[PDB]
Amino acid sequence: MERYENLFAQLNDRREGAFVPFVTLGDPGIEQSLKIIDTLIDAGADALELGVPFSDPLADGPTIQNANLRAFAAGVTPAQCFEMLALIREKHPTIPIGLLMYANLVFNNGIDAFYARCEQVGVDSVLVADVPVEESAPFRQAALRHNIAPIFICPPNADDDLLRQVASYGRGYTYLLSLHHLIEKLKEYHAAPALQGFGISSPEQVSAAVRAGAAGAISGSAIVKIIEKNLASPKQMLAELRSFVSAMKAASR
Template sequence: MSRYQSMFERCKKENTIAFIPFVMLCDPDLETSLEIIKCLVEAGADALELGIPFSDPVADGPVIQQAAIRALENKATPSRCFELLAKVRLLYPEIPIGLLLYSNLVYRRGIDTFYEECKKVGVDSVLIADVPLRETNFFDSVAAKNDIEPVHILPPLPSEQTLMKVSQSSKGYTYVLGRAGVTGADVAAKMPSEETMQQLKDYNAAPAVMGFGISKPEQVTAAKQHGFKGAISGSAVVRIIEQGLDDKRKMLSELSGFIGAMKAAT
């Protein structure tokens, strides 16, 4: 059983859904990033979604863009991110770890080498934000060779063909967008139609997790009531980091409180 399967089974027994925070690796620097990730896990995160800093994050809004810039300015590299991932896996052997990143980072390292490194450091899933669904088969095949679960995004108002393809190819979980556009906490998520949720079940899709626009506990509760098995929050988490750069202790305290409240809402 994969780490994701184990997590979703545990949540089902506890009558909760998974809460999954996103942060950028090495933001604002490698040492602080590890402290932040430890804080997230110890405050109640069920899984982690982590970004590798990139200079042109086209799917991200300004908050996460700034996180990437901070990390890059502090000498973040993919190699340092993999070193950090190895440390996180050593500390937390059971928590699912997913990467959300951009294709240039994969190509630059070499597709086979990238997925081999993911396996080596204990990554569970990879979502490549800027690869169109019609072009994912090769990435998915290399991921499968390395026991990495590919995750794909289901956009709002998907066509039947898109819904079927995402259901068939997304393995760790199904990333369902709460709204169109880029990441950000300023515009709230909207629930997909009941028909879409039923079609995901009919196609035996991996557990549906809502992302984009999740920033408040009541939105997590609404996601659960709508049938989602998890909720991802990124910009709201990263904004706490951004606002606490001058006071690390306060920042970690506020992160802990936010994660605790979001998990309680599950």
């Protein structure tokens, strides 16, 4: 599978960027999560980024923090997370699916084995947020043996040596953490297409990202706040996601 390459070649044919929403799998319940995700895609999401509930998300803040809670409360295991992944793929054959994970869950039953399970359910990439590039060898190696793209975060405090490693080791996309120059350098080293993430919550910010050279934008707190705010009116919540996604995606032209 080569789903990131194909989505970017396509969007370039249309001079468009990617709009990629993030949610926490199983929030606020297994079945409502599936409907939310399907709504995102239907509204125009180009790829998905998904999280798995984890006891210590040290790279995360509050709207998000509260989604994990709602997740552990409804009784979601990792196992249920993978069945969900499996059916999301069975429903949508070409959309790239990306996971955002922490290290202990990938290490628990064997690194090799976590990436075998992702490949079996049809996951396209995994970003391990608390694994810096300097320590990423066994994860990148595992990922690639199972056809999974290993993702790296390129920080704002990146220096040259860092971009070069990031370019050299990531595949599918680069995670550009909230920039123009960093974007040029990435392209100069032939890095995977950059997606800008953190803080994207309005159409003007997606356009600004495409205009700067990013191949697209990842929106996670904004989505998740729409879910928080709307826990008691599933219908409206879905209606809200749909207008939001549709507009963010329009701003990617």
